[PDB]
Amino acid sequence: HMAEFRVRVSTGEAFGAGTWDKVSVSIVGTRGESPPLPLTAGAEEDFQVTLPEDVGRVLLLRVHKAAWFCRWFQLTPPGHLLFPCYQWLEGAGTLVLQEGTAKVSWADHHPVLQQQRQEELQARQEMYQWKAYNPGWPHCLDEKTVEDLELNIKYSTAKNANFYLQAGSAFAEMKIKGLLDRKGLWRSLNEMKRIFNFRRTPAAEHAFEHWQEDAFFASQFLNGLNPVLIRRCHYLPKNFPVTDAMVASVLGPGTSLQAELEKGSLFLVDHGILSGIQTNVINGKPQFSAAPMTLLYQSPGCGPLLPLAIQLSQTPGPNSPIFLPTDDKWDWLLAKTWVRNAEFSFHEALTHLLHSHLLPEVFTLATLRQLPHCHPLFKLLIPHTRYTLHINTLARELLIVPGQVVDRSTGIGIEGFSELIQRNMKQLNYSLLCLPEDIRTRGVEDIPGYYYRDDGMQIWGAVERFVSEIIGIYYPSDESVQDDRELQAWVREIFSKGFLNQESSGIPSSLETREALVQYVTMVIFTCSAKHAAVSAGQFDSCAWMPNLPPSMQLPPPTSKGLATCEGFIATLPPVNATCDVILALWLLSKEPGDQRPLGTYPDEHFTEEAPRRSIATFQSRLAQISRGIQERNQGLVLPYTYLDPPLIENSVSI
Amino acid sequence: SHMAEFRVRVSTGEAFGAGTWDKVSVSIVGTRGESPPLPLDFTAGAEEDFQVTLPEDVGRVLLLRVHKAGPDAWFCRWFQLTPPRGGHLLFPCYQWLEGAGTLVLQEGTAKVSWADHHPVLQQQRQEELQARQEMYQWKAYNPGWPHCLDEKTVEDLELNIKYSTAKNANFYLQAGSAFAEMKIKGLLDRKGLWRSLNEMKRIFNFRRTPAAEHAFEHWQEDAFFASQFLNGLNPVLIRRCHYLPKNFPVTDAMVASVLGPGTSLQAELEKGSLFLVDHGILSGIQTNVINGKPQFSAAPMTLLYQSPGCGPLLPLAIQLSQTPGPNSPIFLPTDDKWDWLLAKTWVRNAEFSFHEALTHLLHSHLLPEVFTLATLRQLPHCHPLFKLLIPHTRYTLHINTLARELLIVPGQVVDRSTGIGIEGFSELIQRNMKQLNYSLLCLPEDIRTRGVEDIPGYYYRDDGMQIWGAVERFVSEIIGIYYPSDESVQDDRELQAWVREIFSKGFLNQESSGIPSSLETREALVQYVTMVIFTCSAKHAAVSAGQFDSCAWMPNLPPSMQLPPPTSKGLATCEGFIATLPPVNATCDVILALWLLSKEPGDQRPLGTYPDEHFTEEAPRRSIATFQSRLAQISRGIQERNQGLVLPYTYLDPPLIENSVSI
Numbered sequence A: 001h002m003a004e005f006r007v008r009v010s011t012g013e014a015f016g017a018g019t020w021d022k023v024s025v026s027i028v029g030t031r032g033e034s035p036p037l038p039l040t041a042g043a044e045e046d047f048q049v050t051l052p053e054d055v056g057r058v059l060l061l062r063v064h065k066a067a068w069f070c071r072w073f074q075l076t077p078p079g080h081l082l083f084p085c086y087q088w089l090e091g092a093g094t095l096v097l098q099e100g101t102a103k104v105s106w107a108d109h110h111p112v113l114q115q116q117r118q119e120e121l122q123a124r125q126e127m128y129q130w131k132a133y134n135p136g137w138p139h140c141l142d143e144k145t146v147e148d149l150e151l152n153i154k155y156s157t158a159k160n161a162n163f164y165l166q167a168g169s170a171f172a173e174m175k176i177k178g179l180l181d182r183k184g185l186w187r188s189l190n191e192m193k194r195i196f197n198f199r200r201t202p203a204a205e206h207a208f209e210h211w212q213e214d215a216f217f218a219s220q221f222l223n224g225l226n227p228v229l230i231r232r233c234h235y236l237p238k239n240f241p242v243t244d245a246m247v248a249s250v251l252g253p254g255t256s257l258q259a260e261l262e263k264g265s266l267f268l269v270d271h272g273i274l275s276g277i278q279t280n281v282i283n284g285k286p287q288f289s290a291a292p293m294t295l296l297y298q299s300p301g302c303g304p305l306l307p308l309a310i311q312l313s314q315t316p317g318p319n320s321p322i323f324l325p326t327d328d329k330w331d332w333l334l335a336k337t338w339v340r341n342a343e344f345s346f347h348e349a350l351t352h353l354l355h356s357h358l359l360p361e362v363f364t365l366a367t368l369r370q371l372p373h374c375h376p377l378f379k380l381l382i383p384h385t386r387y388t389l390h391i392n393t394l395a396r397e398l399l400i401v402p403g404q405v406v407d408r409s410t411g412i413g414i415e416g417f418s419e420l421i422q423r424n425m426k427q428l429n430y431s432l433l434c435l436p437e438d439i440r441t442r443g444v445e446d447i448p449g450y451y452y453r454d455d456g457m458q459i460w461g462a463v464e465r466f467v468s469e470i471i472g473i474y475y476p477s478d479e480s481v482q483d484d485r486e487l488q489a490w491v492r493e494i495f496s497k498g499f500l501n502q503e504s505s506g507i508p509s510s511l512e513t514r515e516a517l518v519q520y521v522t523m524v525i526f527t528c529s530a531k532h533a534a535v536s537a538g539q540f541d542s543c544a545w546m547p548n549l550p551p552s553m554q555l556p557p558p559t560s561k562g563l564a565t566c567e568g569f570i571a572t573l574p575p576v577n578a579t580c581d582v583i584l585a586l587w588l589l590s591k592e593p594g595d596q597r598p599l600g601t602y603p604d605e606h607f608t609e610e611a612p613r614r615s616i617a618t619f620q621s622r623l624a625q626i627s628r629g630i631q632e633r634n635q636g637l638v639l640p641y642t643y644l645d646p647p648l649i650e651n652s653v654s655i
Numbered sequence B: 001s002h003m004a005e006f007r008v009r010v011s012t013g014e015a016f017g018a019g020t021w022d023k024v025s026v027s028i029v030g031t032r033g034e035s036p037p038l039p040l041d042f043t044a045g046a047e048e049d050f051q052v053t054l055p056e057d058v059g060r061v062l063l064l065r066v067h068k069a070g071p072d073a074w075f076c077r078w079f080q081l082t083p084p085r086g087g088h089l090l091f092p093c094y095q096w097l098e099g100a101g102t103l104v105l106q107e108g109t110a111k112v113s114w115a116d117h118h119p120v121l122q123q124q125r126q127e128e129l130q131a132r133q134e135m136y137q138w139k140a141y142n143p144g145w146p147h148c149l150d151e152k153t154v155e156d157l158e159l160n161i162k163y164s165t166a167k168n169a170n171f172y173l174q175a176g177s178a179f180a181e182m183k184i185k186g187l188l189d190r191k192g193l194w195r196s197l198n199e200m201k202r203i204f205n206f207r208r209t210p211a212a213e214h215a216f217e218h219w220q221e222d223a224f225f226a227s228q229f230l231n232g233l234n235p236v237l238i239r240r241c242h243y244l245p246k247n248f249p250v251t252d253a254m255v256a257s258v259l260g261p262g263t264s265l266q267a268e269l270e271k272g273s274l275f276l277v278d279h280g281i282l283s284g285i286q287t288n289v290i291n292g293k294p295q296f297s298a299a300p301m302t303l304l305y306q307s308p309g310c311g312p313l314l315p316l317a318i319q320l321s322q323t324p325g326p327n328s329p330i331f332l333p334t335d336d337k338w339d340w341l342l343a344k345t346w347v348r349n350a351e352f353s354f355h356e357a358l359t360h361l362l363h364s365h366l367l368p369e370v371f372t373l374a375t376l377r378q379l380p381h382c383h384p385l386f387k388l389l390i391p392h393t394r395y396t397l398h399i400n401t402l403a404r405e406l407l408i409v410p411g412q413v414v415d416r417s418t419g420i421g422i423e424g425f426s427e428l429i430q431r432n433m434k435q436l437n438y439s440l441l442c443l444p445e446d447i448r449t450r451g452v453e454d455i456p457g458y459y460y461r462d463d464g465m466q467i468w469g470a471v472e473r474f475v476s477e478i479i480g481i482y483y484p485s486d487e488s489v490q491d492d493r494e495l496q497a498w499v500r501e502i503f504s505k506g507f508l509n510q511e512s513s514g515i516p517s518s519l520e521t522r523e524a525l526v527q528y529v530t531m532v533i534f535t536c537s538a539k540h541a542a543v544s545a546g547q548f549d550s551c552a553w554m555p556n557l558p559p560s561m562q563l564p565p566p567t568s569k570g571l572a573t574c575e576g577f578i579a580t581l582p583p584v585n586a587t588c589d590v591i592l593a594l595w596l597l598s599k600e601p602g603d604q605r606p607l608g609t610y611p612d613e614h615f616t617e618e619a620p621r622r623s624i625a626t627f628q629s630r631l632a633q634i635s636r637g638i639q640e641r642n643q644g645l646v647l648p649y650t651y652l653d654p655p656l657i658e659n660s661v662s663i
């Protein structure tokens, strides 16, 4: 009853993907199990093997080891069966692999495969465990050091070398110039240009030149570091008491303020969440924050969005002036940079960290814990989780720990960041995580020049259509979705570990329809790729000119108008060493250091079936069409929005 | 009316930023009074002549006043005043002119206080000396420690003693990359034991030298463990044994294996073939707590035997405690591999504490800083001793304030990653101050005191005595130029004051030190200045160059131990070897620090290289050129000797020895 197969093995092209250890392979069939059979990087050599007995239909492929990065196996019966791996093998350890054809739990009921799914999941759950990092926070990976991470989720040796090779020179450049050891104020606004001797960019250059333009201050809520906040005002908030006399200049004697509310041209940026937030100490001095509201007016006939009024405090009264554009330059300019400072604290804590990094990590951890290697959802999602656990543990290990940059140079400090995350978690909402629902809800479907909306809506449509073709392949009905016990346990873990079982969040705790499943997968894949890129790519473009994005403030918000001066303004801005401490951090975290794979590109061919590959080719094609329409729209913009060009978007959160 | 026409040539340092757009002018002061400040109506590296006439006749020039106008920093190197109908006057400077002030320069001709009795030149010294005293002051950093510069931050230092911009660039680029690479990896945050001895080879992925590799390949060898006491990082401890110490009892039976039946152990004491390495100063020292785990240290004693006919130096016995007894086993090369190995790693651990606090820190950083701070305060710019010593102090004050600011503060490598910790370092220095003596600072007496003059394979001694001889013959030539007699030395009040401050602020007026508080002979001054020079250059280099080479393999130089030394034989295991070893984050933090401390980060000027022309007269210049060629001859013998050595000794190669302690 002897049997023989041809074994093809493909090792990784990465540094040290090959070993010198011996490798055996067992073959599990429908009849029985085969005895262990003994067999550099980028190698694609074949092997010969003779089963002492035929095990019938091929069910599992076990690969014992005597690290080694395997890509895929290929066995040949007396026909071809691909066993995609794309994992690491360290020391002695066996790896069980099902065939590449994606399989839901109900798809194959033979007992050897069901028992294998659970075993792998029982292992992944002991391998990747949750921890309560902080009260009110999403749960995270329960590891302390990147030295505690497995090779499969660890940062690539090449990519790591890129990151610590750049941070060394970038830190070395700034410390040599004394900028990291000046604990006092900037000599002048003129001296803040020295930052451009460190790193330069046409976006940063544009930010410095148009810094004082109300149209540039008002367009950054649409196309800047944090464009999610802007929402249309149905009414003027009671907290913000603006009058016609305040805006008669910008609006002119033609229209009224209510008359603009009814047209839908009045908009609002509300940083109220920073109200009463705990502040940090920098160089022994107290650091302050505002809780600003800014009124914005959209000009008639596709004109510029213009600000109308700024109230730094969330409490109305005589000691919280409503600064206007018509006010003295230093009063109006000061009010604007208090908002820009409000944007910084809000963006880095919530928009970037809470939504872009913590939520993507919850998606990743639940994917490894609940979806086995052969599940279609795993193959679809796993490339959008790459490196996300490494970059987070790296963040809890290097960024928000006492004595680090958040503690050293932020006006909110680690305390403030945690409180904002705890506060913002309780208002989290499914709509704001679904781009089309978010922009319908905020009432910003109609405002012009909103390139983050235009591009996202484009990218959201492509992913949703890709996801649907994939869900349509493997899920024939709603009943098939409801019966996927692994899928349901995946959404539940996310709802509890990530969203803390909050009902007001509206995040589904279960998926009952294919449409709901498509929507849910799109949101995950989107926030792991396009969403992070749109809030991360322009960090240095926004802070390089420090007044554009101040990380801290050293004087309380002004209680009266007619008091700000050049000297007081500079006095209020952060110190030098803290200015550069953040700028250096934001520069390192604005681009992928190395080994970057663009949205839609899946070199790890987990999908081996013809139907999924056809869907990937179509997805990739559509993304190219979007990238060309963006390049066409940017041809005529003084400042082109490039944060959502698919080619410059990363598959997962790795930076 | 008398009109004076002078040709004024000025050289600007080519250091970046050394040029200035400030309007600089000069004023000449001579026997016939001072002149009106005359402006020169300057880029880095450029030399430029100027022509400006004095309103009156100034007589024979005495001083040159350099004036700068009103925030830039200009580095002047030298002025040159050429009067009409010939003549030359060279005013060496080599200082950063910062802000808006004036420098008072004397002619290059070196002057002892008694050399010129002119009243304006005498007043120039006192005013200069007074400014140096207000500028550089003393402070008691810690009881029992040497006094040091009273500056808190490196950002408070003056540019003249600050690190060179080019140097700051090289060092910070290297320190940035190194620290960033280890921090990003998570090596500085990984608490817990090493997985194995193989995982410790990961260090060589971070950095690697042929010396460090040799320490790994031969780590377990007895001949290599012993040879490190002669040619290693801490080569100043081994001494001859007149008798075996009573506290550490070794019997013929114990060592009969190595010595063989041909000779008794008392016969080897008479033959001078027995040596001892005593780490007793660690006994009862305070330990540190690393990652919440109590750390340990020993106070071992190593008995070493010198094989005849230029045979390898091999260890006879290691006692890990100063108190002998049942719980102080005397380990022998016949014990189990984990026992003998574990014993030797404790000695390696003892070697680390002793070297970094006493050898490298106290002896090669704190005393150099004393010598530096005394010549700044007591020897004026025109003094011959100033000219001779000033290059051997370059950057010492910056690096030492950097140390107290970045190295010995709580939450630094000594605090977090050292088994002894800050307290144990201060305790060691406080203890070692009492044993300090003149004989251990002068290499000839040192090697003779320890009786290590005849031991073979002792490259630190061979090269040291060569370098000491060249520095003394060179020091003797400069001293012979400017002091004609012994009363010349006694008459030099600035000199006697200089030596007086060192004995007080540096040795704490300890009579046991044997350090001169006065200098009566010019033979004694030659010996004193030679000692000062050597300590600043060759001493530090020898103990500094091989820091990473010795600690790359963590077992070879582990910085802390996590278990007490064993009280019994036969209880050692591979598993217990790793358990006792220091944690990973403690390991990589020390290796990162030693890597950055082992070499000069650019801006290197070797022993004998004096780019700044302080000595203008021909006589001192001929001694320098002679001293430089004698050094090159020494360097050539070392290359010839190293040609036939597997592990060459390179730490005392003059070309590789810095003029001053700057790393």
Ligand SMILES: Cc1ccc(CSc2ncn(-c3ccccc3)n2)cc1
Pocket (backbone or CB within 6 Å): A348, A349, A352, A353, A357, A391, A392, A394, A395, A398, A399, A405, A406, A409, A410, A551, A582, A585, A586, A589, A655
């Ligand atoms: C002032 C300031 C600076 C930084 C941030 C970071 S937000 C984020 N997300 C991931 N990060 C990371 C990954 C890897 C290593 C370090 C950090 N950082 C917010 C605010």
Ligand SMILES: Cc1ccc(CSc2ncn(-c3ccccc3)n2)cc1
Pocket (backbone or CB within 6 Å): B356, B357, B360, B361, B365, B399, B400, B402, B403, B404, B406, B407, B413, B414, B590, B593, B594, B597, B663
């Ligand atoms: C582990 C250890 C213990 C003690 C010593 C004393 S030597 C010294 N002197 C100045 N150092 C320095 C200054 C600034 C930044 C780094 C180092 N290091 C060295 C190494």
Ligand SMILES: [Mn+2]
Pocket (backbone or CB within 6 Å): A352, A356, A357, A532, A536, A589, A653, A654, A655
């Ligand atoms: Mn990011």
Ligand SMILES: [Mn+2]
Pocket (backbone or CB within 6 Å): B360, B365, B540, B544, B597, B661, B663
């Ligand atoms: Mn040193």
